[PDB]
Structures are given as C-alpha cells and as structure tokens.
C-alpha cells in the first residue's frame, strides 16, 4: 500500500504515500496506459469539494480540526445554501493557488512553488478592468528583467453564461499570418487566433514578431481588443557568442512566459481566467518555439549558415544546429540580464525538489513525458528518474477555446 | 472501443481498436500512471490456466493464415487440448513457433525497430539438452546474424519451461558485452554497468584480461543445471573502432564498440508457454551507443574527455558543453559503423520509419502498442517525429517479458 520509485543513475529510491490522495481519472486503466495522450456542479457535488479543501488548508496550518476550522466548515457550508456557490478567504486563495502549482505534474519549475505572488482580481467586472489587472501583472512579473512568478485570479465561473476568459493562450505571443502562397509569416501556431483578432479589428503590422493584442472577455460579454503598452513587453535579441552571422538571422523572443488559457480549480470552484507567469527554460524557446517544424522552423536556415552536410540525416546536422541555437538563446538572455534557466540547471533543480517533496510531503506527482527536456534527454538527471503521475487538488486544468464555445451578441 | 491518438506535428488522427485484445497489467490504475516505471510487481501454469491461453493463441494463429474455423484449426485445438490434459503442457508446431516469435516482436511496445518484425530468422533450438549444446546454437546465431557487417535479425529458441526447476537461461543480459572491473579505489575499468556479472564470471573460473573492452564469456544454463562458461570465438565478434570524420584526435580516444546487439535475458511467452532463453538480435540505433553507452554517467562517461579535446568552455552548464560534445560523439559512431559497412540506423531515420510502421499498423491491424517513454530517443527528442505522436500502451500476447536475474533465483550444487 506504498509505492517506490527508483533513480537508475543514482540508485536512490523514494517511497510514495501522497498518491493515496488522488481522485480524478488519470485516463489510464490496468489495460491501457495513456501517459502520452495530451488530454484523456450541483448542490451535492460542490459541498464535498469545498469540504476537503478547507480540511486540506486547516491541516496545513497545524490547526486541523481546530475551534476555528469548524466555523469555516460551518460558514462555507452555510453560504452554499444561500448563494449556491461560495467565496474563498484571501488566505484560502493564496494557499490554493500556490498548491495548484505544487501539484502541476508537468511543471519542472516547481521548486519555486511557494514563492508565488498572488493578485486577487475577483472584484473585476469589465474587459477594461481585466486589461488593468493584466498590465499590472506583466509589469510586476517582468521587473526590469529580474523576473518573479505571479498569478492574477479573475472572478470564478458561476453559471457558464458569464465566464471571464483570456482568449490569448499566453499573454505574450507573436502573430501568425497566412501568406497568399500557402506559406506562413510569423508564428504558425497562432494563425487562427491572429485571424480572429484581425477579424475583430486588429490592424496587423505583418512582420514576424508582432506582439498580439489582448482579447479579454469579462462576465460572458463579447471580448475586446487591448494593445499591451510596449514599454511592458520585455524582449531579447538572439545573438550567438561565436557566430557573428547569427545576429543577422533577425531573431528575437520575449522574456515573460505567461499561461492564460487554463482553469484553476480550488475547493470545487472554477477560475477560468487565471493568467500565471514564470520564467523560461531555454529549450522552450530554442528547441520548441524556434525548431518545431510547425513553428518558426529555422533548422534548415541555421545549418545552411553553419554550412553543414544537409543531405543525409545520419550527419546529425539538425542535432548540431539545435545545440547552437540553444546556446545563443541562453547567451542572449544572460547578456541582457533577463532571467532564464537552462535545462541542466532546471532538471537538477527538479531532482532536489522531488527529494524535498518526498521528505516533507511524501510524494511528488510528476509526468516523465513532460518533465524530460526536448533535447539531450538522457544527459539530464530526470531522464533516469522514475516518476509516478497522479492528480491532486487544487490544480490547473485545460478548458475549451472560448471561440469554439461562445455565443455572441 | 474506438480510442483516438493524434500527432501534434501533422494533425493526423488514428483510431485504435486493437487495444480491445489487451491483457496483463500495464501497471497503471485510474488513479496512478506508471508509464515511466521500468518494471511492475515454482510459479508455473496449471492445466486450467493453460487451456484458455493456448486456445486463444491457436485461434489467433489460424485467423492469421485465413483458416479460422477450418478442420485443420479444429483438429489442432483438440490436439492441444488433449496434450495439455495428458502432459500438463503442449508443444508448438514449428510454424506456430515462428509466427509466435515474430508477433512477440511486433507486439514489443518499447521497440522502435518494429518495421522489420516480419523479416525475422527463427532458429528452433528446442532439441538442445546441454550448456555445450547451447553454446553451439548461440555461436551459429551470432555468425548468421553478424553476416560480415550486413546484420540480420534473428532469435534462437531453447526448450520451454516445464516445472520451473529445469529452466534454460542465458545468464548474460546481452550475448556480447564488455567486462567491468571495480578497483580498490572505487574507480571502474571497462563498462561499469557489468561489474556484478563480471564478478560472477570471475568467480566461475573466468580469467579476466582486465581491459577496457574485454568481451565477456558466455554463461549458459541448460535444464536447471549449474551454468557453465564458454568463450565466444573472437573471430565471430565483430567490432568497430570509433573515429570522427572531422576530429583527427577522436581515434586517439581509443574507443570501440561491438557491432551486434542481442538481448538474452528476456522471456518469450507464446500461448501460455514460457521460453526463458530466447536470445534475439538486430542492429543498433546509433544513440544506444553514442548517448547511453558512452555518455551515461554510470557508463563509459567520456563527455568530459571529449569536451576537453574540443576546447569547450566547461565552466558553466549554460555553455551547453555536454550537449555539444554529445552530438559530435554520436556523429563519430554513425560515421564509423557506416565507414566499415556495419549495419546501423540513426535516430532520425529510425523514428521516421517507426511512424510509417505505426500508421500502416493502425490501417492494416487496427493499432500499434507503443511505449512513448522508450520510443523517443534519448537525445534531440522533439526534433524526431515520435515525440509529437500520441501512443497507446497495452500488452498484447505473444510477448517478450522481463524475468528475474538467474543468479538471484538458482539454487546451486
Ligand atoms: C518559475 C519558472 C518556471 C519554469 C522554469 C517552468 C517550467 C515549465 C515548463 C518548461 C513547462 C513545459 C511547458 C511547455 O512545454 O509548454 C511547464 C509546464 C507547466 N507549468 Fe511551469 N514553470 C515555471 C513556473 C510556473 C508557475 C509560476 C506556474 C503556475 C502558477 C506553473 C505551472 C505550470 C503548468 C500548469 C504547466 C503545465 C502546462 C500544460 O499542461 O500545458 N509553472 N513549466
Ligand atoms: C532490427 C533492428 C532493431 C532495432 C533498430 C531495435 C531498436 C530498439 C531500441 C532502440 C530499443 C530500446 C533499447 C534500450 O534503450 O535499451 C529496443 C527495445 C526492444 N526491442 Fe528492438 N530493435 C531491433 C530489433 C529487435 C528484435 C529482433 C526484437 C525481438 C525479436 C526486438 C525486441 C525488443 C524488445 C523486447 C525491446 C524492449 C527491451 C526492454 O524493455 O528492455 N527488437 N529496440
Ligand atoms: C508559467 C510557465 C513557465 C514556463 N517556463 N513555461 C510555461 C509554458 C509557456 C508557453 C508554452 C507554449 C506552448 C504550449 N504548448 C507557448 C508559449 F508561448 C508559452 F509561453 C509556463
Ligand atoms: C534486439 C535489440 C536491438 C537493439 N537495437 N537494441 C537492443 C537492446 C540491446 C541492449 C540494451 C542494453 C541496456 C539494457 N539495460 C545494453 C546493451 F549492450 C544492448 F545491446 C536489442
Ligand atoms: C505494458 C506491458 C507490456 C508487456 N509486454 N508486459 C506487461 C506486463 C508487466 C510489465 C512488463 C514490462 C517489461 C516488458 N515490457 C514492463 C512493464 F511496464 C510492465 F508493466 C505490460
Ligand atoms: C526512469 C525511466 O523510465 C528510464 O530512464 C527509461 C526512460 N526511457 C528509456 N528509453 C529507452 N529507449 N531506453 C531506456 O533505457 C530508457 N530508460
Ligand atoms: C505526444 C506527446 O505527448 C506531446 O508531444 C508532448 C510530449 N512531451 C512534451 N513535453 C513538454 N514539456 N511540452 C510538450 O508540449 C510536450 N508534448
Ligand atoms: Zn499510465
């Protein structure tokens, strides 16, 4: 009734008891494992989700079953009778937001989990208010380059008709344009959203790295376009410490990764607009953003200027060019004093974290498929780490795109 | 009953119906996924356990040859059923043996090489009775499979398990491996992965040359008896010296690797029968050597030396000095194997072939069990197509399974 996991590089073994607290499906069964699938209330249903979280919280402050505690257990249960839902105390919102990050199985950055700055935006009511909260988030988090992790939490879902949503998948993305001759300008992953913003009245500059506008939806109304003041959008020009022609590539990338399309679930409530931001692992930019074939796809471009044998795959010209690109990302950010972590430091930090979590908490849900970096996998320590994956609450979940689901006016 | 998988690089979606035939545990539950665990958690079948397993294997063999429900199919079932009832086991026809072996390979969810599953040379060694006999069967396998560098997939199959007390085992984990010697001071000579098995060999009288690339003796076990030592004849062990197309100094490293990878510690399960000794071999993907064998810290661990020779700034990690030297190593391995006309496949060619295979298998067979954590190569993962491919993992039989290390199990005399 316990589970061990081994590190085959170190032969260290850890015992998992924390898993005895999951409930949502993994999607796997004893007959099929779905570890690589990207995606596998009423009166009744809300009470116990709230109940278990309050017990969770009060257990986290020594005072489990305390004289206080039951008054909150009382008050929360009382409020659900009247408003149907209920509202978290500031204490609960901060705990719940920090623990959703703590339980994000796919996040390698979680050693930093309790150093989360929470911004309570639950008094927001209009897209204009949303824009204001988001601008203050970006400015705080960017912090001239000394980035700090933060989340802004907008009002919880109530009936579905009046959701608050950030339609951008991230606060800061570059735009994607369909070129008349079948090709794509900018970031290909963003063609659809970019066409919506254009359809919505955005006047695109139609270059590669055009920062998309914010498309914010408050209280179920139609979304509205807002352009983020550029003085808040910190960007880095990508140069190489060896190749002088590298600056000639015209490459830049922004400094603030901020996820804005996910759903945060605390005690049964559903915060559908909860943008959060950290700082980059270099491979996110170098390997995935620049080198996916469905993204900026610069491998051919870089190897050409490196003059590499591009005919046979066994020359490993893609591998060589990949390493160089990621050297330039990490070097460009460090030269411009913008926070960045390479995949070796990042993965070394996550082994520490797993060690911490097993000692003080008894388990750390982790998704090997996402924690292992997209490059040089086995030379990082997480590659040889067995992990158990299980779903703990509070949690970040996916949700449908608003445009697939929104009935306009 | 109609599970979907998506490729996130191409948007292709495939429909899996084959999963309905799955069986033994994945190791996962609705509450915990174990897809990154390496393993799970007198033991021989009864007449009652065996009847169903055999029937279903026979039913599926006869379905494969478009003879399901035929009189041949019906007599075979009755022949098997009676044999299990009288002898508490049964013997596969040779045709069934070959189909079973090929389909355990087809079914092997961790194998990226499966596009070759049906071109497999099966050697029926079920008439073997002694360790000397095994040595001979293995020598023939090595020579056939090596083929002067034009490698050829093969398996040799020794007698099936009876009561567990009389098993055939190849105590080696692979038929060709380099010895590893721990030292007084904690350093290791050779291959640190093989320190234990080397010590066993030495205990059994093997006189070790104590070198960085010593081919281990074979340690063969017939019919539950004590294992016995045999030296593979060196002329049958094809090796490749590792050099680099650009760095003249790379040969000064003194690297070499053997050409033939051949797994000899697994168990082949066909129709409820267990062939505890079934060495099988193919050809290498370069990353197996150039990433895992040479660059794992618990292995030969040469990144340090190679970076040095490349004059790499190794002060910080964010120089990516390990990444940079790992690439030039794997370039050298591909270049060496190719230079000497020894069959090898790079990780990009191999993953592209496997996507092609996996699609054809959905189309023609209705699914293709795959283990993402093992299919993705341990370098440059996301620039290979398997990284963006959703995969369903389930156990199809016939199958290769892990089994305990024999030295942990065997009782001596
Ligand atoms: C502080 C620096 C951080 C780093 C270096 C980091 C690193 C990463 C990386 C590399 C991924 C993979 C993302 C992808 O491939 O698209 C990821 C996923 C994730 N991170 Fe972090 N992270 C950080 C902070 C945070 C914070 C502050 C939160 C929430 C408050 C968070 C929650 C998540 C979640 C929920 C995912 C899953 C994404 C998904 O399912 O698509 N992370 N993280
Ligand atoms: C023909 C060329 C082949 C190639 C290129 C190939 C490739 C691979 C690779 C790269 C692995 C991962 C191994 C590791 O990281 O330790 C693997 C695993 C495996 N292969 Fe293949 N293989 C080939 C032939 C075969 C054959 C002939 C069989 C059986 C008849 C087979 C059955 C397996 C099995 C059972 C595993 C799982 C190993 C384990 O879980 O320890 N393969 N293969
Ligand atoms: C909090 C956080 C930190 C970090 N270090 N990374 C992320 C993911 C960010 C991200 C992902 C994707 C692709 C998601 N499939 C595109 C982006 F523009 C983006 F910012 C989030
Ligand atoms: C048939 C086959 C083909 C291939 N291409 N690869 C393999 C795995 C072979 C192998 C694995 C390990 C590590 C096992 N823990 C060490 C070896 F020396 C070795 F040959 C098997
Ligand atoms: C998915 C799966 C495939 C297979 N053939 N057999 C099993 C049974 C138990 C088992 C064996 C192995 C080693 C053989 N792959 C790895 C596992 F994760 C595992 F659960 C499971
Ligand atoms: C813990 C983890 O499951 C382990 O390191 C696995 C990961 N993936 C692998 N993939 C392959 N091909 N070979 C391996 O040995 C491993 N090891
Ligand atoms: C198919 C596969 O599950 C999918 O491509 C996953 C694999 N691992 C990943 N890991 C990270 N960090 N990010 C990703 O987008 C993915 N994609
Ligand atoms: Zn699973």
| DSSP conformation letters of B81-117 | HHHHHHHSS----HHHHHHHHHHHHHH-TT-TTGGGT
Q: Are residues A245 and A289 in the same domain?
A: yes
What are the DSSP E strand ranges found in A267-337? 269-271, 276-277
Work out the burial of residue B374: count CB atoms within 10 Å of its CB; fewer than 13 is exposed, 13-18 middle, 19 or more buried: middle
Strand B273-275, strand B344-345: pairing: unpaired
Q: Are residues B305 and B274 in the same domain?
A: no
CA of B7 to the centre of ligand 7 (A): 11
Known catalytic membership, residue B283: yes
Question: In 3D, which of B305, B212, B189, B293 has the Cα closest to residue B252?
Answer: B305
Question: In 3D, which of A256, A220, A219, A252 has the Cα closest to residue A238?
Answer: A252
Contact B342, B240 (CB under 8 A): yes
Q: Alpha-carbon distance B309 to B250, whole Å?
A: 8
What's the reported resolution, in angstroms, to a tenth? 2.2
Looking at the domain assignment, is residue B2 inside a domain? Answer: no
Strand B344-345, strand B284-285: pairing: parallel
Helix axis angle, A317-335 to B321-339, nearest 10°: 170
Known catalytic membership, residue A28: no
Q: Are residues B80 and B28 in the same domain?
A: yes
Question: In 3D, which of A312, A313, A342 has the Cα closest to residue A325?
Answer: A342
Question: In 3D, which of B168, B408, B397, B134 has the Cα closest to residue B275?
Answer: B168
Q: Are residues A229 and A127 in the same domain?
A: yes
Looking at the domain assignment, is residue B392 inside a domain? Answer: no
Contact A266, A46 (CB under 8 A): no
Does A28 contact B23 at a Cβ distance shorter than 8 Å? no
Give break positions in chain A: residue before each, C–N beyond 2.5 Å.
40
Q: Are residues A307 and A324 in the same domain?
A: yes
* Residue B121 host element (H or E): strand B121-124
Instruction: Name residue B157's beta-bridge partners.
Output: B124
Looking at the domain assignment, is residue A390 inside a domain? Answer: no
Cα–chain center distance at A132: 21
Q: Alpha-carbon distance A335 to A246, whole Å?
A: 15
User: In the structure encoding, which two tokens stand for residue A311, read together?
Assistant: 């005919």
CB within 8 Å of B116: residues ≥ 6 apart: B153, B282
Dihedral angle over CA of B235, B238, B242, B246, nearest 10: 110
Instruction: Name residue B393's beta-bridge partners.
Output: A33
* Residue B6 host element (H or E): strand B3-6
Q: Alpha-carbon distance B226 to A69, whole Å?
A: 67
The sheet carrying B121-124 orders its strands as B121-124, B154-157, B280-281, B262-263
Q: Are residues A222 and A270 in the same domain?
A: no
Q: Alpha-carbon distance A240 to B180, whole Å?
A: 42
Q: Are residues B139 and B119 in the same domain?
A: no
Domain carrying residue A61: 16-122+149-159+263-277+347-371
CB within 8 Å of B316: residues ≥ 6 apart: none
- A311-to-A307, A314, A317, A318, B265 alpha-carbon distances in Å: 12, 9, 9, 11, 39
CA of B206 to the centre of ligand 1 (A): 53
HSE toward the beta carbon, residue A226, CA cutoff 13 A: 23
User: Which residue has a Cα nearest atom 24 of ligand 2?
Assistant: B282
Work out the burial of residue B124: count CB atoms within 10 Å of its CB; fewer than 13 is exposed, 13-18 middle, 19 or more buried: middle
Q: Alpha-carbon distance B329 to B326, whole Å?
A: 5
Q: How many residues does chain B have?
A: 413
The Cα of B250 is separated from the nearest Cα of chain A by a number of Å equal to: 16
Q: List, as one string, the DSSP characters of B289-353.
A: IIIIIHHSTTTT--HHHHHHHTT---SSSTT-HHHHHHHHHHHHHHHHHHHTT--EE-HHHHHHH
Contact B222, B130 (CB under 8 A): yes
* Residue A266 host element (H or E): strand A263-266
Q: Are residues A26 and A113 in the same domain?
A: yes
CB within 8 Å of B263: residues ≥ 6 apart: B173, B174, B279, B280, B281
Question: In 3D, which of B289, B296, B300 has the Cα closest to residue B331?
Answer: B289
Work out the burial of residue B413: count CB atoms within 10 Å of its CB; fewer than 13 is exposed, 13-18 middle, 19 or more buried: exposed
**CA-based radius of gyration for chain B:** 23
How was this one solved? X-ray
User: In the structure encoding, which two tokens stand for residue A307, read together?
Assistant: 């003059």
Cα–chain center distance at B103: 14
* Residue A50 host element (H or E): helix A43-59
SS3 state at A252: strand
* Closest residue of chain A to B38, computed from CA coordinates: A386
Question: In 3D, which of A130, A132, A94, A131 has the Cα closest to residue A113?
Answer: A94
Instruction: Name residue A259's beta-bridge partners.
Output: A170, A276
Q: Which B positions 302-341 lie with beta carbon below 8 A of chain A?
A: 303, 317-320, 322-324, 326-327, 330-331, 334, 338
Looking at the domain assignment, is residue A285 inside a domain? Answer: yes
Instruction: Name residue B103's beta-bridge partners.
Output: none
Question: In 3D, which of B237, B231, B238, B257 has the Cα closest to residue B335?
Answer: B257
Q: Alpha-carbon distance A402 to A29, whole Å?
A: 31
SS3 state at B182: strand
Residues of B in contact with A286 (CB under 8 A): none
Q: How many residues does chain A have?
A: 409
Q: Is the CB of A281 under 6 A from ligand 3?
A: yes
- For B254, list phi and psi in degrees, rounded to 5: 70, 25
User: Which residue has a Cα nearest atom 21 of ligand 2?
Assistant: B111
HSE toward the beta carbon, residue A271, CA cutoff 13 A: 28
| Interface mutation target, options A297, A319, A338, A344, chain B, most CBs of B under 10 Å | A319
Instruction: Name residue B29's beta-bridge partners.
Output: none
Nearest atom in ligand 1 to the alpha carbon of residue A149 is 27
**B249 among the known binding-site residues?**
no
Q: Alpha-carbon distance B174 to B261, whole Å?
A: 7
Residue with tokens 């978290």: A88
Q: Are residues B186 and B203 in the same domain?
A: yes
Count structural domains, chain B.
Answer: 3
Looking at the domain assignment, is residue B30 inside a domain? Answer: yes
CA of B396 to the centre of ligand 8 (A): 16
Residue with tokens 């081919």: B215
Q: Are residues B70 and B177 in the same domain?
A: no
Cα–chain center distance at A159: 26
Q: Which B positions 262-291 lie with beta carbon below 8 A of chain A?
A: 286, 291
Q: List, as one string, the DSSP characters of B274-294.
A: EES---EE--EEHHIIIIIIH
* HEC readout, chain A: CCEEEEECCCCCEEEECHHHHCCCCCCCCCCCECCCCCCCCCHHHHHHHHHHHHHHHHHCCCCCCCHHHHHHHHHHHHHHHHHCCCCCCHHHHHHHHHHHHHCCCCCCCHHHCCCCEEEECCCCCCHHHHHHHHHHHHHHHHHHHCCCCEEEECCCCCCCCCCCEECCCECCCECEEECCCCCEEECHHHHHHHHHHHHCCCCCCCCCCCECCEEEECCCCCCEEECCCHHHCCEEECCCCCCHHHHHHCCEEECCCEECCCEEEECCEEECCCCEECCCEHHHHHHHHHHCCCCCCCHHHHHHHCCCCCCCHHHCHHHHHHHHHHHHHHHHHHHCCCCCECHHHHHHHHHHHHHHHHHHCCCCCCCHHHHCCCCCHHHCHHHHECCCECCCCCEEECCCCHHHHCCCC
Q: Alpha-carbon distance A63 to A55, whole Å?
A: 10
Looking at the domain assignment, is residue B40 inside a domain? Answer: yes
- A209-to-A39, A186, A187, A250 alpha-carbon distances in Å: 30, 6, 8, 10
Dihedral angle over CA of A8, A13, A14, A15, nearest 10: 120
Q: Are residues A204 and A155 in the same domain?
A: no
User: In the structure encoding, which two tokens stand for residue A17, read together?
Assistant: 């008891």
The Cα of B332 is separated from the nearest Cα of chain A by a number of Å equal to: 9
Looking at the domain assignment, is residue B5 inside a domain? Answer: no
Looking at the domain assignment, is residue A230 inside a domain? Answer: yes
User: In the structure encoding, which two tokens stand for residue A88, read together?
Assistant: 């978290």
Q: Are residues B245 and B317 in the same domain?
A: yes
Q: Alpha-carbon distance A133 to B192, whole Å?
A: 57
């Amino acid at each position: 009734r316990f589970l061990k996991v081994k590190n085959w590089e170190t032969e260290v073994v850890l015992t998992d008891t924390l898993h005895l607290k999951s409930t949502l499906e993994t999607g796997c069964t004893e007959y099929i494992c779905m570890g690589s699938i990207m995606h596998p209330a009423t009166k009744d249903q809300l009470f116990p989700l709230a109940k278990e979280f309050i017990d969770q919280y009060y257990s986290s402050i020594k005072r489990f079953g305390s004289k206080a505690h039951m008054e909150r257990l009382e008050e929360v249960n009382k409020e659900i009778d009247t408003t149907s839902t209920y509202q978290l105390k500031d204490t609960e919102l901060i705990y719940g937001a920090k623990h959703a990050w703590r339980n994000a199985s796919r996040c390698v950055g979680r050693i930093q989990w309790s150093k989360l700055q929470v911004f309570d935006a639950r008094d927001c009511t209009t897209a204009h208010g949303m824009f204001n909260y988001i601008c203050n988030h970006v400015k705080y988090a960017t912090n001239k380059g000394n980035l700090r992790s933060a989340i802004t939490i907008f009002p919880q879902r109530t009936d579905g008709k009046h959701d608050f949503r950030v339609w951008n998948s991230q606060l800061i993305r570059y735009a994607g344009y369909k070129q008349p001759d079948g090709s794509t300008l900018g970031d290909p992953a963003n063609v659809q959203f970019t066409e919506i913003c254009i359809q919505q009245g955005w006047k695109p500059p139609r270059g590669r790295f055009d920062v998309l506008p914010l498309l914010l939806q408050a209280n179920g109304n139609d979304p509205e376009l807002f352009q983020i003041p550029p003085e808040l959008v910190l960007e880095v020009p990508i140069r190489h410490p060896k190749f002088e022609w590298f600056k000639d590539l015209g490459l830049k990338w922004y400094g603030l990764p901020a996820v804005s399309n996910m759903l945060l679930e605390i005690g049964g409530l559903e915060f559908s607009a909860c943008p959060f931001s950290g700082w980059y692992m270099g491979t996110e930019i170098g390997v995935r953003d620049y080198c996916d074939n469905s993204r900026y796809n610069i491998l051919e471009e870089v190897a050409k200027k490196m003059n590499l044998d591009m005919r046979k795959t066994s020359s490993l010209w893609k591998d060589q060019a990949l390493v160089e690109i990621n050297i330039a990302v990490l070097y460009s950010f460090q030269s411009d004093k913008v926070t960045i972590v390479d995949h070796h430091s990042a993965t070394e930090s996550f082994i520490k974290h797993m060690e911490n979590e097993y000692r003080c908490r008894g388990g750390c849900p982790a998704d090997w498929v996402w924690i292992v970096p997209p490059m040089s996998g086995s030379i990082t320590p997480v590659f040889h780490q067995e992990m158990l994956n299980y779903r703990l609450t509070p949690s970040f979940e996916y949700q449908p795109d608003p445009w697939n689901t929104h009935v306009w006016k």
